[PDB]
Write a protein that binds this ligand. Sequence first.
Ligand code: HEM
Ligand code: HEM
Ligand code: HEM
Ligand code: HEM
Ligand code: HEM
Ligand code: HEM
Ligand code: HEM
Ligand code: HEM
Ligand code: HEM
Ligand code: HEM
Ligand SMILES: [Ca+2]
Ligand SMILES: [Ca+2]
Ligand SMILES: [Y+2]
Ligand SMILES: [Y+2]
Ligand SMILES: [Y+2]
Ligand SMILES: [Y+2]
Ligand SMILES: [Y+2]
Ligand SMILES: [Y+2]
Ligand SMILES: [Y+2]
Lengths: 471, 471
Amino acid sequence: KTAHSQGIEGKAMSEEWARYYPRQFDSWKKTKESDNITDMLKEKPALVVAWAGYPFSKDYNAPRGHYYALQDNINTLRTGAPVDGKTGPLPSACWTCKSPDVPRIIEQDGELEYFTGKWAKYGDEIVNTIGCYNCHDDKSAELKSKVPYLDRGLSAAGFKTFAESTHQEKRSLVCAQCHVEFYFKKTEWKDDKGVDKTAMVVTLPWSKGISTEQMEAYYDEINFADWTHGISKTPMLKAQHPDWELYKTGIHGQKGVSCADCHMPYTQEGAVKYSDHKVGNPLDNMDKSCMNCHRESEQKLKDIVKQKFERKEFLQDIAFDNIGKAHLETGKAMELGATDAELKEIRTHIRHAQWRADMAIAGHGSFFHAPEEVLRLLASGNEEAQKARIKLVKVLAKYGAIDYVAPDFETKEKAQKLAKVDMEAFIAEKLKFKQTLEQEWKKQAIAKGRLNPESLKGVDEKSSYYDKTKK
Amino acid sequence: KTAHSQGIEGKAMSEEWARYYPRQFDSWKKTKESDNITDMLKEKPALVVAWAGYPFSKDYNAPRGHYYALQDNINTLRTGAPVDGKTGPLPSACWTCKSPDVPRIIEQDGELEYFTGKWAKYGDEIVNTIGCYNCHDDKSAELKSKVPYLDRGLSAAGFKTFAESTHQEKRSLVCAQCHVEFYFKKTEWKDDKGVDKTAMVVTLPWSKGISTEQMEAYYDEINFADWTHGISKTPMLKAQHPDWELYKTGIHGQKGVSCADCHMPYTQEGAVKYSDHKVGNPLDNMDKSCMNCHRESEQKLKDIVKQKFERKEFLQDIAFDNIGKAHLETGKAMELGATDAELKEIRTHIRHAQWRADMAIAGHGSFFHAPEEVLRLLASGNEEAQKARIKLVKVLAKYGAIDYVAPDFETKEKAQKLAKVDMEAFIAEKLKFKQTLEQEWKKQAIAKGRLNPESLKGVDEKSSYYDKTKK
Ligand code: HEM
Ligand code: HEM
Ligand code: HEM
Ligand code: HEM
Ligand code: HEM
Ligand code: HEM
Ligand code: HEM
Ligand code: HEM
Ligand code: HEM
Ligand code: HEM
Ligand SMILES: [Ca+2]
Ligand SMILES: [Ca+2]
Ligand SMILES: [Y+2]
Ligand SMILES: [Y+2]
Ligand SMILES: [Y+2]
Ligand SMILES: [Y+2]
Ligand SMILES: [Y+2]
Ligand SMILES: [Y+2]
Ligand SMILES: [Y+2]
């Protein structure tokens, strides 16, 4: 048994676990050190054209430490500027993978209620970032999935559930609670008091399997779209960080090496080993992360990883350039009077092209976790985009525009103008939200004892649109 | 020292080495067991369109055992039907990687003379297949490169020469005498008796490095073409089995694992280890070839290799389909009156597309030796082909043919009709050569003591155009 066998009062606040587990708590907090904001729309402005009409065209940054997850959810322009609990663009589901308060609220309101309403609904309740309670039972400290959609997805794909899995499988599945592709399923229900309500429920599209092509077939069968493209009017699918799904295609996943083997390696003390809880870049500490299994030099292994990154970059830039041109050429054909019927096959190719290429790139470690699948997916996506473009030349010709040259989108600014994103406006609106309602959320949470101000130290120094200078 | 320190009389006949090295001789001869003819034009008829105007559009099969190398050189339709030493389509250089008689003849006539004249010039001299003398010194039995163009290539690429290399490097370089990409450099010279002569000299295009892109730059700088495409009139480059060059890109090559580690593994006897000389498929004997370094099951490792093959097939079929369509669409634009100036950029894209895709596929183990580079090359080649095709739509439109559909080439027969290859004719001509001059070559060689009839057992049972039923 543990020293807390009856459970932990205030379990959602990770600081409550420190009295039992100071070493894990200390390493866990050090994800504070990974504070860099890499603006992916600035680095890869093609992505802005790809996501025209969708919030990712406003703000999309690379992942940083878990310490920043909740605050980054609040800061992103994607969550907009609510004025109260009933406003703002996005739903409650946007908290789900950000906070140990999520399982707390599900365990209290129920899953459907939690998934009902606006993101802003829970601003003064969901206030702790990725914590011990997201991954551990507060009585036994055993690894646990705390979200019901993971087992749902596992079963649908023919996998064992979390409870049915081996320990080594659990050492990846805990991460898969969050590090997976998902969509929101509109779900009608009726509450305790008989009121009809609509939830938007996190759902893993895994019932045909976890390959990119199986998920594409799933989404096509249910005629699903995440949005209608703001330029080409294609019914689009958004990939989100399919980290676990791609990791399963790759040699390490095939061999049985878990997420935790590289990202939470064991550290040394006799009978008292412990797991490094500073989840970050395994290349920072290769002796702990790789050199237990590898006999090459660290430098040769790092050079190999760099090569993989460069291969992915090469194919990523080609795919998204053709995807971007295809969207723009479709928009031009629409301007000239091309019909939906004339554009249907083209739009199908664009949807598929971008689904495949986004699934390849949306997991930021996939270029390493599953290099060969990433390259094959980028190649396949590019081919779909080029099939669209070949068909588009003939549509453009039909309407007298065979010599049309799609505009360039080589800077974020130029791309956002094509996507009709008024950043200035969104940022100004966001700042006013942060200055008012967000501060009310934090004050109320602290007053109620849901939030410890210690957790906020340096948490809000940077976003893609400000930098006070260090997190 | 060896038991043959003064050298071996008749060294080019491998059977002369048997008295010293019965175990190596016995295993070496067992490449007889790899007798399958896989007709690659039947399997991948797109290749026929790709090679229209070039001998590979007639006959191209997968590699089989070394035991068949010389006979396969004679059988292939590519070497045609000489009637004497001054006829036939191909040059003397075509023997170079087929026979221990090659170093013998170079050591006697000189390199330039050897490289001067027709393939048929040496039909009654070059009569032994890949032998001990291709890889070993006949005094010391040490590993030796016997062909001068390898060191030339190594130096040009900044590599150490064979003599300067480590033992483990030599255990790949011996193979690289043959298992490399090459071209024939037209070389004017004057002989002993002052006669002007023209050699066609095997040359490795490595002076900018050994990557596919570096070789493409090399060939472009010297304005080289292997042939003018029979359909698109593009100045084409042919890739030939760049096995070693690609192997160097791959993780095993990067780690230092040699060709011989997998293909000529050590076998067990105490102080008397020996190397398995039956060069073939390492997957036939995984315990000898892989399981010394790998802890996964054999079956899991084989399943992984199958996955790599399937990825390569997927991308290969896409690339060559678009390459084939691009050649055919160019031919149609030419028929309509398109000018060379109008087609110049297109033809450049086709040349590059096919160079990259052929370099990816022409090494039949590359999908395993360097999987990620193979996928990246197929992706890059496909992109070049699709750039050509997009430009072609506009040329076709200019000439009133925007709705043109390039013909299908899904069978060898259909593809060869598009390529204007009269197989029947070539085969009939070939059989008459085999029935007459080839038999004269063999009879003369046996009479002169250059050829042992024992070496011919079952060697000529199969080609792509006959099968007496077993080799
Ligand atoms: C042991 C399992 C896990 C692994 C190996 C893992 C891995 C990672 C890595 C490497 C990063 C980026 C860190 C950096 O850039 O330095 C990250 C960020 C992130 N992870 Fe995890 N993670 C795990 C569990 C989870 C869980 C359970 C959740 C959800 C409750 C989650 C949600 C996130 C979020 C939202 C971010 C982005 C943080 C931000 O940018 O502010 N992860 N994770
Ligand atoms: C649409 C509602 C959501 C919003 C607004 C949101 C917001 C964010 C933000 C701002 C980031 C940091 C990187 C970035 O700037 O994009 C992030 C990263 C991340 N989120 Fe979410 N999130 C949402 C839904 C989800 C869900 C439902 C999950 C779990 C199933 C999840 C898991 C993660 C993970 C694992 C990362 C780090 C990996 C990466 O960004 O590639 N997110 N999210
Ligand atoms: C400060 C908060 C946390 C505390 C106090 C805590 C505590 C512990 C303890 C006591 C162990 C077993 C001993 C060890 O291997 O170190 C452990 C291991 C582990 N924890 Fe945590 N943990 C925390 C946060 C997290 C989070 C957020 C995750 C998921 C993203 C996580 C995932 C894991 C994993 C995968 C192991 C390895 C388990 C095994 O191999 O048996 N931990 N942690
Ligand atoms: C971040 C740390 C690591 C790095 C940089 C790394 C690097 C690599 C690379 C480059 C490969 C070749 C596969 C490919 O094409 O991608 C590989 C394969 C492999 N790695 Fe790792 N690795 C790491 C961690 C580990 C760990 C912790 C283990 C053991 C638990 C491991 C065991 C293996 C195994 C079993 C293979 C398959 C090839 C074989 O059987 O040797 N690796 N790794
Ligand atoms: C599903 C299990 C895993 C998850 C959820 C996961 C999570 C992640 C994430 C989110 C990233 C991107 C971080 C960023 O760009 O900010 C990443 C990168 C990476 N991961 Fe994992 N990982 C998993 C398995 C593994 C394994 C098994 C290994 C080692 C064999 C590994 C080694 C790495 C490496 C070397 C990087 C790239 C670091 C760099 O190049 O900067 N990961 N991982
Ligand atoms: C130890 C170094 C070498 C390795 C690892 C190697 C590997 C191979 C392999 C695996 C095959 C196909 C075997 C099969 O399908 O069963 C092959 C065929 C071939 N090899 Fe090598 N080889 C080596 C040395 C050489 C040398 C030195 C030459 C030139 C003198 C050469 C020329 C050829 C030729 C012409 C074929 C095709 C035979 C035919 O299809 O009739 N190889 N080699
Ligand atoms: C143009 C003159 C040549 C001809 C007619 C010729 C003929 C052949 C034939 C018939 C094969 C069996 C596979 C097939 O059907 O294509 C073969 C395979 C092979 N040849 Fe040649 N060859 C020539 C030049 C060379 C040269 C100069 C080298 C060495 C630098 C070489 C090395 C090899 C190797 C290593 C193979 C087995 C690998 C593979 O086919 O992918 N060949 N050759
Ligand atoms: C029947 C003809 C041959 C004979 C009698 C012969 C003889 C030998 C001998 C005595 C050794 C050293 C002992 C051993 O490792 O087994 C050896 C090794 C070797 N031979 Fe051969 N060999 C023949 C054909 C070839 C050919 C055609 C090649 C090249 C394609 C070749 C390449 C090698 C290699 C790479 C080694 C390993 C050398 C080392 O690791 O030190 N052999 N052979
Ligand atoms: C035909 C036999 C073999 C097979 C099927 C095989 C399979 C593999 C595979 C699938 C990988 C992952 C790299 C990739 O993405 O392609 C790999 C990597 C690797 N293999 Fe092999 N291999 C074989 C022979 C060998 C041998 C003989 C050695 C040792 C002399 C070796 C040592 C390695 C090493 C060092 C790596 C890099 C990853 C690591 O450091 O573990 N392999 N092999
Ligand atoms: C430059 C050095 C090497 C050469 C010249 C070479 C030669 C070849 C050739 C010509 C093939 C195609 C045979 C055919 O399709 O008929 C092949 C396939 C293959 N080679 Fe190599 N090889 C080399 C290095 C290696 C190494 C280091 C390994 C092991 C790590 C290896 C393992 C294999 C495997 C597994 C196949 C595929 C067999 C199959 O899927 O049927 N090779 N090799
Ligand atoms: Ca999605
Ligand atoms: Ca060539
Ligand atoms: Y407490
Ligand atoms: Y990061
Ligand atoms: Y070290
Ligand atoms: Y790989
Ligand atoms: Y003798
Ligand atoms: Y073969
Ligand atoms: Y075994």
